[PDB]
Amino acid sequence: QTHNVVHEANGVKLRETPKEFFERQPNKGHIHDVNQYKQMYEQSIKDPQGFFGPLAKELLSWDHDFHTVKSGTLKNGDAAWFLGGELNASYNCVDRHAFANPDKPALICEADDEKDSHILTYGDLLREVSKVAGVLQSWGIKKGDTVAVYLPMNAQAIIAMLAIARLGAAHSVIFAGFSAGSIKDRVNDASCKALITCDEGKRGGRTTNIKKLCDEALVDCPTVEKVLVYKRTNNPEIHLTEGRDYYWDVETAKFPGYLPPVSVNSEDPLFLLYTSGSTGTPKGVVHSTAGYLLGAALSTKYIFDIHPEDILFTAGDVGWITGHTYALYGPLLLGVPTIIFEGTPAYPDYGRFWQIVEKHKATHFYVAPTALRLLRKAGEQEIAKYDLSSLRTLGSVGEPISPDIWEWYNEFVGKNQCHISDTYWQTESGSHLIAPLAGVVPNKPGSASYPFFGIDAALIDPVTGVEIEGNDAEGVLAIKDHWPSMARTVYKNHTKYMDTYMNPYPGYYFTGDGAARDHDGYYWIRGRVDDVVNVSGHRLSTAEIEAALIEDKKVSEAAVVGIHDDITGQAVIAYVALKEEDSEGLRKELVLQVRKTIGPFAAPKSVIIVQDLPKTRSGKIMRRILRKVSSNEASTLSNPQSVEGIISAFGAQF
Template sequence: MVEQTQKSHISLDHEKMHAPPEGFFERSTSKPNLADFATYQKMYDQSIQDPATFFGEQAKQTLDWIRPFDQPRFPADKKDDFKNGDLPAWFVGGQINAAYNCVDRWAAKDPNKVAIIYEGDEPDSGRKITYGELLKDVCKLAQALTKLGVKKGDSVAVYLPMIPEAVVTLLAIVRIGAMHSVVFAGFSSTSLKDRILDADSRIVITADESKRGGKTIETKKIVDDALKDCPDVRNVIVFKRTGNSHVPFSPGRDLWWHDELAKYGNYFPPTPVDSEDPMFLLYTSGSTGKPKGVQHNTAGYLLGALLTTKYTFDVHEDDVLFTAGDIGWITGHTYCVYGPLLNGATSVVFEGTPAYPNFSRYWEIVDKYKVNQFYVAPTALRLLKRAGHKYVEPYDLSSLRVLGSVGEPIAAEVWHWYSENVGRNKAHVVDTYWQTESGSHLLCPLAGVTPTKPGSASLPFFGIEPKILDPTTGEELKGNDVEGVLAIKSAWPSITRGIFGDYNRYIDTYLRPYADHYFSGDGAARDLDGFYWILGRVDDVVNVSGHRLSTAEVEAALIEHDLVGESAVVGYADDLTGQAIAAYVSLKKHKLPADADLEAIKKELILTVRKEIGPFAAPKTVLFVDDLPKTRSGKIMRRILRKVLAGEEDSLGDISTLSNPQAVSQIIDVVKTSRK
């Protein structure tokens, strides 16, 4: 069981219900994917009562199969889901190919239909790629990878910026039945190395350099630094993003993207893969510190990505979806690459940031390409709200029908700003809750159908059976107006099938904390109307700008500094990033010079974390303390550290049982001093 959650201060006012915008469906030229709320309720009930039939029918209707499946779900009965670490198998006996479903079938229908709109870091530096063009490039790279010895089931590491070649890369890898392991291109060489080694990747695909926010990033150099400790990597395919002739290049190992693709023809047949064959790995932070290689399998993931894109955003073939999320995270995988392309829509791939060259960049893109669905993290929205309405007002945003939010709960005032200033009160705001491990949405409104409440993730998607459990006893808290931890009762098609190379860790993390349930790691409440509210992590994971970071991982980086004896990392509320990282650090007094410059040491510690993990993981606050509060068994009491940082010194509880209760008063003094 997990530490008892605090009673939340969030308003669960059941009166604040917002109906979908009037005339929502009339603003689309296509027939609604979901007629009304009653239809959602009927479909949802069927998906819970008979998931085998429900998802079997959906899979037959929406995906193209190389060999039809024999059983939609085995076992069909969901009563034993999660028992003893068991998961059902989906679409048993079926064979499919992800790239075919994303590209070939749409290229055959209309090769001139635009699949990807690329907007570069600099305005007006992009281009459009049709489904026909995408198919050719995917097939060429698939042949190049095959020639380099990549086989079905192998993993290929991907370290690329947000450029069309990133989409081509993912689709080429799955076309030959291999797994992609995408590493966010903001991670350090150390983090990249760890992920290459854990996934046992022998091929890396990267770029010479990257452009972001007007800055040039030495992408290939980071890869080279990582590969110093990766002797099994055979080849590195390098895309020329900037063409800088001074970028390091190792003949024999390194290969230029354009040279490799020029060797091959325009078509290469897709490899049939079994429904439950692995499709990709994506590393996410865990409470133990070591990143987890979350494994998603093919057919279930594809169906989850397709259906949630279709219904959550009401996406049709003639729509343009702009997901402002990097492919290094699950949001980019599911809703920038696979979801839009599985539905035959057009996806915007944006290389830059919302603030470059000014705060109007997103709205300029929406206006220029007549975007219909926009999906972004609250961190960016807070930044843009703070910048002011003057950056939004000049642009024609009338094409927008759906405004999505992802990564963390969206505050009510930001929700209203988003709806009123960006959506002009005509677009439906859908605040979505899901995880890397879920593959696709768990809780979310459905566009044009579900009533919404600012700050609430609303209701479950098809097949998702959420439960609120008592965090101490594990008993289900039935009815409404309850608060506890969020768990899911039965499996859904896109659920992760495990942690790569460590299935026991998968069981310990997700299935063992609460018997017969999948444990989300989040606290949640169900209000008087049955709407769900996410209250934040209940484990040692912090959420910075929608990125989950392990406190243990950051602590391990801090300990790398020669002067650090101990460290404890906690998250705290931040107006811009949602949560920020605070590091409590106890220095080695015997190594500390008498004239030590503590401010300089703070900067060194922040740089250490940036180097070991990446810039986004750097602590915003570093506090030097004499000692950290510990239980008599030696466990650091991060709960106390969080409360002190939040100014809740009066509700620390009984600290007399600590092995060092005197440490708490000194910590309180340090925090108070830091605020002056």
């Protein structure tokens, strides 16, 4: 007790799981007592073979059984799960459920306008996936090909990824916010032979350009042989390059309503998803087929307490890992309907999220902390109008949750009845690492609680590189052994995959996050230790933004850091130095330069112009100074007078 190192633990008492939730369970809970979970967790770490074997056979339908549950080491980067097994993601997500209950809802597609909303049953999802998959096969997509997807968060993207996996190909979903240059690089890296996109998207009542950005990047993408285009708005003046572009509706009507699924090996690539790390250009994270689906199945069934009668709503976009796991695979593997929203929580009214939960009587809701802050400041009153009584579990993902936000979440939406589960994980983790299991774990506000099955959490001292033992401790967060849903490599570049995750601390998986552990065992996440800032959930490497600013001929050097913006969580500020008029206009010109190389979400909130940057004698720009200058101004540098200049221009600009 009386924590000294973990200051956040002090003054925090366990918020017991509300009693109303256990009554709203449609069936007996998967786990009875919290002591039962600790016994399950202890087995997954000590005996991984005896723990995950049965669960894999229970939750996955195998075309061919595996001979070995776990192989490989973190140090050697040769991890593998369920070796010898053969299965298919589209059979487990669609086919098997469509045979039992064809008319059961599968995709509840809620569009930007509710007039364009519709529901697809599992029988319908099987027919549409088979048809789309039939088109890609006639085009020549085979096992081992990568197929790119540039679609908004609607049912069409869900259908696309399943049809690609159905053939044994790997899908690479590119976020619709990205620019043309970001599509160019990502496609060329994967050597995609096909692209699935739409004519244009509609979000918040505005018509976003989609196909036009694809045509721009595709002139520099020679691997793409053919492109599939969906008529989301049916705009007549949308050009389609002959021989390359073909129409979704026209081609799918040519092929039958059932296509045989292609068996893939357990360690065969399921998908690629590009993320930006502290150093280097965005890398292509690869996930295996079997170990990923299992991880998604476990975390969904047990942490969220998902039963066959439940309905899940996950707000995240499929362009990021959250939509991948807990808007598609997780729910569909368990045979429950998932809610896919193509709009924003503000259009038409700020209660749009809550109409959907009322309309479809959703039982589980998954949201990012950046959206809860937006709703509180803007549309807090609308919540009471809608029912929201069907919700049993409220989740949080992507950003640190504040105790202030946690209490607002519990009563304003859950009415002190729902269970709150702060789910900490990563794109590379595939599934949840640390989260409160609903009905089991009493959550401490702000803490992600205990680690999940198969995750052996530990802290490491950053300087000495030793594992810290005990409680009331702080350090770098790392995992001792690999787990089923762990990412297996970076596409065509395993060396950077080792240099990033396995080599910083050999024998450990490097998460890039600082954490603390209290005496109760609950884990507190303190943010990323490398040069990555979480801006509205999007991870952004400072180096990617800095390289975009330097593309302008005038920019001699640039440096970007992050600070706490209330709405966005973190915002990147740009301190740029020019070589040798209209200073305010050039600042805006740099903002679109970042918006052109990367996308609109990378644009800095402000750009401060200084002649000299705070540098050490060797040359390293003192990012610690620029960080504090943004907030509070209170070591050895080259010129200290330059610091007064940076403070002068910061107030002048921001």
